Amino acid sequence: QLKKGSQVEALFSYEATQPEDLEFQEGDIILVLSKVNEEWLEGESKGKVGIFPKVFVEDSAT
Amino acid sequence: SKPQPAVPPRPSADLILNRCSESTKRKLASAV
Structure with missing residues (x-):
């Protein structure tokens, strides 16, 4: 089977400098694995697990 | 053009x- 956390479209290209920090470009469809602290959440996009701030993803359809 | 947060x-x-x-977690695994 396959599980899922949530979803949130992107809006800005986040410059990733740290590891856990999931990097993503403007307007994107990342796979939100879950909520991490309201201001951030789990991010798994392209065989890579990290995280990102919800501020860069006002979401479109979860 | 938009100024990211x-x-x-x-x-x-x-x-x-x-x-x-x-x-x-492997990225962090530091806790505290």
């Missing part, structure tokens, strides 16, 4: 360790 001090690795997958 100055990213804030991402959640404490630990709370992430509390709300993330073992994968992302």
